[PDB]
Ligand binder design. Structure first.
Ligand code: HDD
Ligand code: HDD
Ligand code: HDD
Ligand SMILES: [Ca+2]
Ligand SMILES: [Ca+2]
Ligand SMILES: [Ca+2]
Lengths: 672, 318, 673
């Protein structure tokens, strides 16, 4: 692997320059012990110059992200449906690297911003690198790639003052959304709990676009990729996401890192929906339109293989920061479609790597290299790392005996465009009328959420739109929401004191679809990796005792347990001063600690109780082991997802069921 | 002030960068549901610009915000310096100032605990003069060659890039404990100075000793102190953490709002002035940037007024 | 080959993208057979994007040059003068790479422009890469690095229209020279035959600056680097260099390439003049002044080892174009001096690579990699190839156990600055007055040339100065030349119609030094690789047999023979249409071909003109077969001239002609003032 070969060991040895000369790097060379630094200090300059040049431009979108290595294993020989080599035998294994991201934030912005998320997977196949550069959400904001800068400028900070960071909660974004109705579907996904997933591990992946699978005989079918999480899906609530941004801006990347270090590497079933070419407009919308999903009732999933992430990078810059994905990295057996969003994307990713890398040889970075030989006539360019032995790099040649040979459908396993694809008509800059329904699928989506999820979504909109200064933009927003659902527009307008416009039922209906709701998708299928905070005290040997015994029984099931006390000591992991409810999926107070919950120089006033109340209001399983304490909280002993038991075993057993349920949604007020 | 470079887009038709009127909402396709054409220059010039919008962030002080203002001299300071912007009572010079945290990337929160930069350009009639200063009057280290060691230790661990904008991790404290010069800046950073209420409520320092040089050749040693006229004020930690999440832009918004409401922040720009012969007279070395000269030993002389009163037009360009 | 690890083989296999996907690259994807090209065609865009970005900026100076790999072998254990590890044992071998170049011309400009030349050597030592970035001439134009852009602007093309390419023959250069008299020394070397060397292999190498040798005990001595050519020194004549520039702009790079390919890799003795610290001002001038040589009479050379170039690159762009030399690549045992031209160079070489490479990681290019492990805390930056395991890249640390360790004089074989070096005084932008004599050494140089060499030098000056438009500049030039030698100013003045000014004898003397004269360094020590052209004819079966016999005999002694005729056939290498006297060091006509001396197959008079040019440029020429007077009379070449040969016998002809090839140039054939 080109990664092993380029690993550099510094665990022994003397400091050297980049050209291998042993040196020191701690004192500048000076004329006299109190004199000025000398230009001839090469040691100073080579070190500072490296440091001066360490940064590269951040990605234009998806700048905040993290990745990991893993493996993809095919479940079957899929030759009946695609020629793709990585899919051509049962048990066939391919190395992968995945990077997850938000969209709008710059590289230091918080993981738990409300946003759409990237899910980019590189398969290093035996017939070349194949990238699926996908999302946590199956539909996108716009219908033509040429609009991407427009969308992105509106959602990124206003350019006079560069405010606000990583947020659609400002005028320009809502102006664009309200002026460009195609945005509604993704908008509804982004405003639901999908905008604030619990972790990268608890989100699906989607290729968004229709692609083709192409067989060796040249026949082809239309496909949508769906990466289906084995950890189940989960979100934060918004008041929790906000606090988390401040307390742990690295929440998602730490979650991914830690799960992999503990042998809980995340898994997804890689699936396709697969349909015939003739069904391009059969489902009541156009499969070239990336704002639409094919409901599962219309085309079920076929499982192809298992994606597992199971090793962290060695150097984040060299691997995560430098990985350069491109939908143009395609392999024989896969082909594009005439999705006008997909089509322009092919151009952008090849071009943008010149900006990041500063030079044309970016496919030579080790993370970008393939796992097979490279035979082509590309030459020179800044940062050329190969030494080519073919001095006759042109086709046709006889001087290198005609090598490299052309690869195509009938030679060298060449890529080939699906040979039934055709084009006809005028050369136009016109939008197909088949793309015009912007509102029926956002409605379908909303209809498919539970009542508490619908409320969350309305509340996300009320929160954002209330921060829009322009009263014109606010009214324009309500006009658009109203075409999806009168009821959403009445509820959102209540909060901003404007009147919804009159119901306009053109795009209304009652249809629902499966697999789009987080709460409706059940208890989590595993609670491993989930986090339990046990609030305890040093003033009481019984407290640390009860804590230790819970720890045993909770760590038993693969929960990450943190014991919190006023000060560190054996058995205590975190002080109250640094603890927060955003740090746990469940909070347990050991009754031995009743007294912290009625001042201290060691932590902010009311910190112990605040954690517990926060946890409760945000819907987490909370409880007391050993009561009265539930009074101090004002937390009802008979509420769902509130546990109080004298027995450790009965407590843990009930509490684990709470963890699976994950959120107690009865704690949230619904509109009338 | 930079009027001559401004570009007005409040009217007109869309053009290319070479003035050809064009559209930019739909790609050119072979047929209405067909593939996009390579000959669509409108599409490629637009996406190419977008693909190349970003430039590398600053290696340190990536997160920051800036504004235009005026420096007004209080006196004719020719008897201490030949510097021309300081040479007549009331003399006015345009400035631009950028404030910042040190360790976080672009996007990180304004109210991380950090040292802060306070950089001022004076566009003088004898050339640009820059004081690239700090909210804290002393720096962590005593030799420039050690800078990448400091910054690598305080920036996120390089295997996973965790934690963002925070000294709260092993590498940084390992460095602080092995490099005892760091103690002075460390104490200031751990105080309320690490979490100012606003850019307007902190002071600015040159940190280094410099020289003033007269037209006759004689010099003096000086430290620059910009003394805030808004007063000093800090957050408390627990509030700074919450604020970092509720409003990552808190200091830039504070500054921007103060200027738009007529409340542009002001500093008195001062120096401690001492003789060449005093370089070691105060019980430490004036060349040593981990040290202050206690005001008991050399009082501040006020040279002029710094007022920031104009927000930029384009954050990126400015 | 030392860079085998990075080689890419394309002698078999199917075309792929840079990411391994097999593809085609001959036809674009179109909507229909006569339709427009599709944006989705990634095969097209990856291929054209690469091509669109193949170029990097050429070097700011020395843009035009050529390189080869080789070996350095130490003749001894040099620990008695230096701690340098590549010099620590008899027969110790170190891979090198060397690049030779001109200075002013762009990429593409002609090898045989009149110029100073670069001679840059990398030693990939077991203690780090060490570069000697030197010259063919021992002295530089200017005494302070800060003046480099002024020198280079004045000698480069004028910036309104970019004329003239690779030439000092224009007003701005001579304005600079006349206003900046430190330039005189280097200017006299450039105007001599050293400005137009016969090949890279026939020139010497110089460090220019005084450096220090430092022993492991911290004592030091001052050194000058001299690389003495084992092929001998040889120049072209100006009228020939000019024709060559147009007939073969690749002359020196081809000469080098062919020499290595035929097993005749060029060699140099790498030497030093060594002197004590306390002799910095003992020789009549300042050793910190890069415009001065230590005459050999005062400090003899010590031979340190053998430099041999014996392997051409595989990819010119990857190896020669990308090699990035720096005097900052220094190794323990060597140190800098306070030469102000050297001091500033340290800065420029590190900085200019950011320009060429477009990013900070240029030392990771294969050609620039060291041959030993790298342990340091430099990280990230564009194009980062390494994946560093150490997650605590700062010092001091405990979390990586204090590694990498600091290296210095007493631990880890660290570089260290010579401990005896000091500075004292005010911080100044003043020139030392010890640097003020700009004229005595150019005069010393002029005196050590033979009378014909002196004529060539005067003629190079007349040629260039006559092309200066400005009469003021021309006057100002005679003023400076006049301070060197009244005689030079008189003789140049005559060409341009101006009086020389009155003798000014402050700096005149009659002193001479060894080893700076090309024409006085005796005959070449070897003639292998020298080029013999045999003019012959297809009309006569017997001319091709004389040519074959003559070929066989000459090739036996390692000479490169070209038979020329009207048309190619077995045994004929080149047509008259392509042949020129610049392609040969010697020209023989086989007397079966006397009749050629008009056709549709070559320009009128071409065969005769080859012989006449060869004679007029000082080459050995002759006629073989026994009947000579018809060729010789057509050419106006006297039968008894030195370097003119006629013999019936092949054996006898060659023995005499080979003496002429060693003499190389017959200087009796050029007029004197
Ligand atoms: C025409 C412009 C354009 C359009 C329409 C899109 N993108 Fe994109 N995308 C970019 C232009 C781009 C980019 C500017 O080219 C980026 C920035 C850095 C890079 O490598 O490419 C990028 C990066 C990028 C990344 C980060 C890859 C990584 O982790 O480095 C993901 C996951 C996506 N995009 C996903 C999408 C999805 C699911 C899209 C719509 C379905 C989409 N992009 C449309
Ligand atoms: C030799 C390395 C080094 C050392 C010892 C310092 N700095 Fe620095 N500084 C840089 C290297 C640097 C830099 C890498 O060159 C930066 C990053 C971006 C830039 O323009 O310069 C910079 C940026 C920078 C900025 C941001 C300016 C802006 O807003 O654009 C400020 C305020 C400072 N520095 C202030 C300081 C102070 C008060 C120092 C100690 C007295 C200090 N620096 C020591
Ligand atoms: C202050 C600037 C400066 C000064 C005073 C000099 N040079 Fe230089 N030289 C450069 C700045 C430079 C440079 C701009 O940095 C180059 C261009 C590309 C590079 O690598 O460095 C260079 C290239 C360069 C090369 C080409 C190396 C190669 O083949 O790649 C040689 C042989 C020399 N120089 C030799 C000299 C000699 C013998 C000098 C006087 C004794 C000299 N230089 C003074
Ligand atoms: Ca806005
Ligand atoms: Ca750490
Ligand atoms: Ca000129």
């Amino acid at each position: 692997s080109p990664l092993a070969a380029y690993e550099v060991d510094d665990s022994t040895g003397y400091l050297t320059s980049d050209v291998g000369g042993p040196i020191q790097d701690q004192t500048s060379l000076k004329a006299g012990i109190r004199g000025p630094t000398l230009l001839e200090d090469f040691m100073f300059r080579q070190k500072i110059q490296h440091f001066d040049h360490e940064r590269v431009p951040e990605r234009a979108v998806h700048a905040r992200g993290a990745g990991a290595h893993g493996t993809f294993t095919s479940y079957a020989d899929w030759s009946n449906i695609t020629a793709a080599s990585f899919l051509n035998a049962t048990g066939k294994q391919t190395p992968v690297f995945v990077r997850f991201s938000t969209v709008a934030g710059s590289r230091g912005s918080a993981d738990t911003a409300r946003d759409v998320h990237g899910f980019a997977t590189r398969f290093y196949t035996d017939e070349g690198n194949f990238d699926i550069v996908g999302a946590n959400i199956p539909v996108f904001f716009i219908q033509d790639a040429i609009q991407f800068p427009d969308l992105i400028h509106s959602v990124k900070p206003r350019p006079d003052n560069e405010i606000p960071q990583a947020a659609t909660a400002h005028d320009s974004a809502w102006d664009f959304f309200s002026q460009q109705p195609s945005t509604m579907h993704t908008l509804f996904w982004a405003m639901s709990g999908h905008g604030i997933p619990r972790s990268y591990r608890h989100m699906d992946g989607f290729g968004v676009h229709t692609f083709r699978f192409v067989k060796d005989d040249g026949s082809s079918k239309l496909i949508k990729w769906h990466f289906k999480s084995r950890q189940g899906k989960a979100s934060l609530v918004w008041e929790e996401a906000q606090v988390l941004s401040g307390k742990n801006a690295d929440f998602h990347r730490q979650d991914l890192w830690d799960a992999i270090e503990s042998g809980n590497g995340p898994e997804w079933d890689v699936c396709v929906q697969i349909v015939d070419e003739s069904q391009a407009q059969a489902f009541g919308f156009d499969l070239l339109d990336p704002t639409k999903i094919i409901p599962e009732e219309y085309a079920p999933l076929t499982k192809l293989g298992l994606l597992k992430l199971d090793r962290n990078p060695t150097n984040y810059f060299a691997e995560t920061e430098q990985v350069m994905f491109q939908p143009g990295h395609i392999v024989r057996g896969i082909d594009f479609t005439e999705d006008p969003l997909l089509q322009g994307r092919l151009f952008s990713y090849l071009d943008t790597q010149l900006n990041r890398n500063g030079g044309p040889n970016f496919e030579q970075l080790p993370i970008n290299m393939p796992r097979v030989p490279i035979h082509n006539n590309n030459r020179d360019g800044a940062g050329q790392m190969f030494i080519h032995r073919n001095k006759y790099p042109y086709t046709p040649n006889t001087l290198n005996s005609g090598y490299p040979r052309q690869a195509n459908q009938n030679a060298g396993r060449g890529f080939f465009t699906a040979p039934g694809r055709t084009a006809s008509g005028a050369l136009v800059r016109e939008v197909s009328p088949t793309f015009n329904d912007h509102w029926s699928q956002p409605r379908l989506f909303f209809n498919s959420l539970t009542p508490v999820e619908q409320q969350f979504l309305v509340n996300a909109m009320r929160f954002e739109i209330s921060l829009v200064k322009s009263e014109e933009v606010k009214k324009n927003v309500l006009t658009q929401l109203n075409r999806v659902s009168h009821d959403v527009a009445v509820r959102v307008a209540a909060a901003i004191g404007l009147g919804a416009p009159d119901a306009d039922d053109t795009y209304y209906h009652n249809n629902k679809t499966a697999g789009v709701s987080i709460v409706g998708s059940g208890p989590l299928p595993t609670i491993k990796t989930l986090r339990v905070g046990i609030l305890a005290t040093t003033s009481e040997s019984s407290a640390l005792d009860q804590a230790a015994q819970l720890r045993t029984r909770l760590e038993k099931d693969g929960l990450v347990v943190t014991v919190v006390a006023e000060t560190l000591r054996e058995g205590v992991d975190q002080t109250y001063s640094t603890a927060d409810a955003t740090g746990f999926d469940g909070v347990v107070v050991v009754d031995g600690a009743a007294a912290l919950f009625a001042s201290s120089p060691l932590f902010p006033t009311g910190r112990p109780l605040q954690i517990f109340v926060d946890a409760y209001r945000w819907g987490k399983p909370v409880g007391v082991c050993g009561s009265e304490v539930l009074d101090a909280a004002d937390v009802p002993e008979d509420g769902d997802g509130v546990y109080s038991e004298e027995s450790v075993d009965m407590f843990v057993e009930e509490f684990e069921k709470g963890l699976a349920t994950f959120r107690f949604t009865d704690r949230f007020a619904l509109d009338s």
